[PDB]
Amino acid sequence: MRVTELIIDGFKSYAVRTVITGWDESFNAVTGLNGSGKSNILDAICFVLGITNMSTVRAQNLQDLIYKRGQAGVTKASVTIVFDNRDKKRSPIGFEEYATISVTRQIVLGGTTKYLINGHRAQQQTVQNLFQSVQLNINNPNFLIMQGRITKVLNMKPAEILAMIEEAAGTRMFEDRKEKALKTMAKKDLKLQEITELLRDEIEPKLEKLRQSMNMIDSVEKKEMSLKHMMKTVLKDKHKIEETIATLDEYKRKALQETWEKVNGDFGQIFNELLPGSFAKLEPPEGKDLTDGLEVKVRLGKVWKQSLTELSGGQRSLIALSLIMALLQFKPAPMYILDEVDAALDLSHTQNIGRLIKTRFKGSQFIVVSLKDGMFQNANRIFRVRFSEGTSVVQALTPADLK
């Protein structure tokens, strides 16, 4: 799936039906000086996707999202996303028969909302299942990168960064075999405790009494031989489980080691493309192990720096962005949104982001919402927004356009 069309009707600053068509399969930028008109395009997208962790499309009464809150001749709102669905390997399950898929979300007076799929009424859960089947995880969005995530990554502790790498390793789905092994061992341990309980409370006291008639001694003495032979065989069965667990802990540590090397390699190459001549790596802090966590180390130019605090604002954004993007491959999504990440960035830096997208993220659709104007001017498709007449208007352009 990839966005081909977005229609915004009676929603926030978009008073009149606005058909925004021509979305590029790889790289779109939303630009211009109309801050509200730009941001409302992202709002409209997140509103249809059902994003619940974005304050700008959240309200006690969603009538607030209708243009002028329903008081200026528009009493309903509608947003539609149209997706191309020709690539059947990336189709939502259960919708493969559609060459295109449209999802519409409506607001009426009072704030109740409804959904349509391909123009027909649809349950909210049907819409959410569709998006989740193509890895647009509305529950915990992987595909939306805001300034807050950049700041959060910049402030993570070594333990928190290693958590990301552990999380990316994909070995908690490995863990299922480990905890099945653990309780087949706990059952083995249980038998050992009841073997020693029998000896302690029953066999050994009786043998000591019988030894201080003569046929009863050897009857109990054989039972002490029985459970001893049993205790031995249980210990060795339990040991085979201990080896099984030892091998899964080994697979765990190798998978993480491999993930660390993959992320660290991509992270440093990405940062070198966003800040040419520079480099970065993920390393344990100093004289510490890998499971005490990983910290970001930066080489500005050819010189390694002791702390991230020594980087400019723009360099800091680029290093966090490079790590975020190096990790996308482990929770991949068919579209990615970079929302207003350019506050501290030069124009050359944002041009570098565009070439990174075009060369390294083929097969995904990027949508970049520019904070400043004049950035991301090499995007394959440019949507330029400005203010007029109590309604936003959108120009659809390319870098090759004369106007």
Residue numbers in the entry: 1 to 212, 989 to 1179
What does the paper say about this structure?
In contrast, even the wild-type (WT) version of Ct Smc2hd-Brn1N was unable to bind ATP. This finding is readily explained by the Ct Smc2hd structure, where the more pronounced flexion of the Smc2 helical lobe not only repositions the Q loop but also induces a cascade of structural displacement events that alter the P loop of the ATP-binding pocket into a conformation that is incompatible with nucleotide binding. The Smc2 head fails to bind ATP on its own, presumably because of the deformation of the Smc2 P loop observed in two different crystal forms, but readily binds and hydrolyses ATP when in complex with the Smc4 head. This transition is presumably the consequence of a pronounced reorientation of the Smc2 helical lobe and coiled coil by ∼25° upon head dimerization, which is transmitted via D-loop and adjacent helices to create a P loop conformation that is compatible with nucleotide binding.
The condensin protein complex plays a key role in the structural organization of genomes. Based on their homology to ATP binding cassette (ABC) transmembrane transporters and the Rad50 DNA damage repair protein, the two globular ATPase “head” domains situated at the ends of ∼50-nm-long intra-molecular coiled coils of a heterodimer of condensin’s Smc2 and Smc4 subunits are thought to sandwich a pair of ATP molecules between composite catalytic sites, each composed of Walker A (P loop) and Walker B motifs of one head and a so-called ABC signature motif of the opposite head. Each head domain (hd) can be subdivided into a “RecA”-like lobe that contains the ATP-binding pocket and a “helical” lobe that merges into the coiled coils; they connect the heads to a half-doughnut-shaped “hinge” dimerization domain. Smc2hd and Smc4hd are furthermore connected by their binding to opposite ends of the Brn1Cnd2/NCAPH kleisin subunit (Onn et al., 2007).
